[PDB]
Design a protein around this ligand. Structure first.
Ligand code: T9Q
Ligand code: T9Q
Lengths: 196, 196
């Protein structure tokens, strides 16, 4: 007989398979709004990721998408001394991905919702602290909104939580379609289709 | 397209595959004495087991073997208000398995080591408490040994920690050989063999 190195290699291949499968499940639970399922899959993905010490460019992209969705899911709820949405913003700006229209739309919606979720929770001192960290005449208008506790300002209705979630969900559908063919999920589906 | 029920079924099949793979890895790490690898695989197995709500007779046996090895590995280190080895003893006596010579040998070695590890750590009041919970003229001899702090008594040399670990390791080799053919590890090895 038994070679330790070849067994460790087989375990690394299987960890790679489990990572893609759990990213796929995390994406579907996020899209579906299945919170408890998302929590469980996130816990599993995090544990499996600890079993890997070297990651390829594709695997790094996979773990960062998982970390990003984890912070987005904790958006209305931590070493950092920033908020979950501010942490999602840092991950989003560092993933190896195209900075296209969708990327910029998601970035700006997260920037504004990082402030709006603090106002929604009644913590306006924190909303000013988040604003200072992100931004830190457009800025003067946003800082006046927070100062006046003008939570339902028309600006916040265009840059809403629901709009942020919808744009992120559209991005998740592209990740979901790119990984729907990964080894583990594909083999699992073939077993279920044989039953039936 | 997309059926929620068929996707959930494919995820349950894949969780079942991951469970056997992680049990195999936990068994090899236990046999090899790779403590940090055992800790990581245990964390992964525990997270994956949370993703299952219904288990077959075979899967229940798998999770209980994992729980048993986890308590054995924590033997010298928790709802219960008993010790890790006492907890392993409860799992061992309830697994759906044959109560053969090896089973009885492992049971008795765990019973004595649950007391001896307390003496090894210098906690003799705890050694008496463990003795009372398990047992609770043979008993009178064991209670005299603990009372006299006679840690290196010849009885403890036949019913040693090393003998307990060796007998448990032989049992692990049977579990290891029964699962070496499971889907995930078998497919992982075929990929590594194609490289080499
Ligand atoms: C807090 O720092 C660690 C961290 O990023 N945990 C979140 C996570 C969720 C899912 C997969 C990997 C990681
Ligand atoms: C403490 O109660 C929960 C428990 O048994 N955790 C240990 C465990 C280790 C590996 C697989 C499943 C479980």
């Amino acid at each position: 007989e038994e070679d330790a190195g070849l067994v460790a290699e087989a375990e690394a291949v299987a960890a790679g398979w489990m990572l893609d499968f759990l990213c796929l499940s995390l994406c579907r639970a996020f899209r579906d709004g299945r919170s408890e399922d998302f929590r469980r899959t996130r816990n599993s993905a995090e544990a499996i990721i600890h079993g890997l010490s070297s990651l390829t460019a594709c695997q790094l992209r996979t773990i960062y998408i998982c970390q990003f969705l984890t912070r987005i899911a904790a958006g209305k709820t931590f070493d950092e001394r920033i908020t979950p949405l501010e942490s999602a913003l840092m991950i989003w700006g560092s993933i190896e991905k195209e900075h296209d229209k969708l990327h910029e739309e998601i970035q700006n919606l997260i920037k504004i919702q990082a402030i709006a979720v603090c106002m929604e929770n009644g913590n306006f001192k924190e909303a000013e602290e988040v604003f200072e960290r992100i931004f830190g005449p457009f800025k003067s208008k946003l800082l006046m909104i927070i100062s006046q506790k003008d939570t339902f300002h028309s600006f916040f209705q265009h840059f809403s939580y629901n709009h942020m979630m919808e744009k992120i969900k559209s991005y998740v559908n592209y990740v979901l379609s790119e990984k729907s063919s990964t080894f583990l999920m594909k083999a699992a589906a073939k077993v279920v289709e044989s039953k039936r």
